[PDB]
Design a binder for this molecule. Structure first.
Ligand SMILES: CC(=O)O[C@@H]1[C@@H](OC(C)=O)[C@@H](O)[C@H](Oc2c(-c3ccc(O)cc3)oc3cc(O)cc(O)c3c2=O)O[C@H]1C
Length: 287
């Protein structure tokens, strides 16, 4: 069973089925049946959204950590509303025409370092923006990563997990930083570890810390010395080593400059971050 985690923005305006006008019904391939709807009332009145109605899905609602009104970010899709009605979970999301799953692509292609620079660069901008909004992922993973019709990254701003006793947080262990596995407290720097795991997996098609079972994987995340694939460039190896520091205080991205520590790394030296943000760099793969 799926659990959706909604990180609600402060001053969130709770919703229900009656705040939405049905406009269209679409078949969106891997997304299944999607309703195009129009918000009737509130700050976002008249805004068009995608609506998903899930049978048997759990909703978890979490708080995030100047009175600003949010605007779109080029590499994020947002969950604006999530509410339960008669056994059904309604999700109101940014409309994503022709969207697809990153995992669909990753299964089909062999990424080079050049390819990964592009996807990780968009992902870094997205993740940092979520951090600024007060969202901490904990187990950022490929299921959180979509591609738009143009092949650009769309990071979901909501959590997705597969769920005898219920847990408030069900994380995919392979993507969790040591301090998260410890449950002894963590910050946004945990997500940069996960960013490193994503990078490692993109480059190698394997996970860096993987045991026979959750318990062993956890042991490995805490104590396992990572065998760095030698085919990787010095720059790739350097970035991975700096993201996989077990002490979060020493981890790249943990300093006051946060994501800039990553953006400044030699692995990303070819990236023009302003052109990237403007969506003026073409993806390695076009859907
Ligand atoms: C595991 C789960 O329940 O994910 C579901 C999707 O289900 C599956 C099997 O693809 C699909 O119903 C649908 O897919 C969408 C997704 C999505 C799909 C797979 C993921 O791993 C993550 C997200 O994201 C959207 C984002 C938007 O901005 C607008 C959408 O309509 C969808 C959108 O329709 O909604 C998801 C919440």
């Amino acid at each position: 069973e799926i659990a959706i985690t909604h990180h609600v923005k402060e001053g969130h305006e709770k919703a229900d089925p009656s705040q939405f006008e049905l406009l269209k019904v679409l078949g969106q391939g891997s997304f299944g049946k999607v309703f195009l709807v129009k918000k009737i009332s509130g700050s976002d009145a008249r805004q068009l959204y995608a609506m998903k109605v899930l049978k048997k899905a759990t909703l978890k609602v979490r708080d995030r950590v100047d009175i600003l009104v949010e605007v779109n970010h080029p590499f994020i899709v947002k969950l604006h509303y999530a509410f339960q009605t008669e056994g059904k979970l309604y999700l109101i999301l940014d409309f994503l025409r022709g969207g697809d799953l990153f995992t669909r692509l990753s299964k089909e292609v062999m990424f080079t370092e050049e390819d990964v620079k592009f996807y990780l660069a968009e992902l870094a901008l997205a993740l940092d923006h979520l951090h600024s909004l007060g969202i901490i992922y904990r187990d950022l993973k490929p299921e959180n990563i979509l591609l738009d019709e143009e092949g650009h990254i769309k990071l979901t701003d909501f959590g997705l997990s597969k769920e005898k006793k219920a847990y408030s947080f069900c994380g995919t262990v392979e993507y969790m930083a040591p301090e998260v596995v410890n449950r002894r407290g963590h910050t946004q720097s945990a997500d940069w570890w996960s960013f490193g795991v994503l990078m490692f997996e993109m480059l190698t098609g394997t996970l860096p810390f993987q045991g026979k079972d959750r318990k062993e994987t956890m042991t490995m995340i805490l104590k396992a010395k990572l065998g760095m694939p030698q085919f990787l460039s010095p720059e790739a190896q350097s970035l991975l080593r700096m993201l996989f520091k077990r002490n979060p205080a020493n981890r790249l991205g943990a300093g006051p400059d946060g994501v800039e520590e990553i953006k400044r790394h030699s692995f990303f030296s070819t990236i023009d971050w302003n052109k990237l943000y403007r969506r003026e760099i073409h993806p390695p793969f076009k859907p």
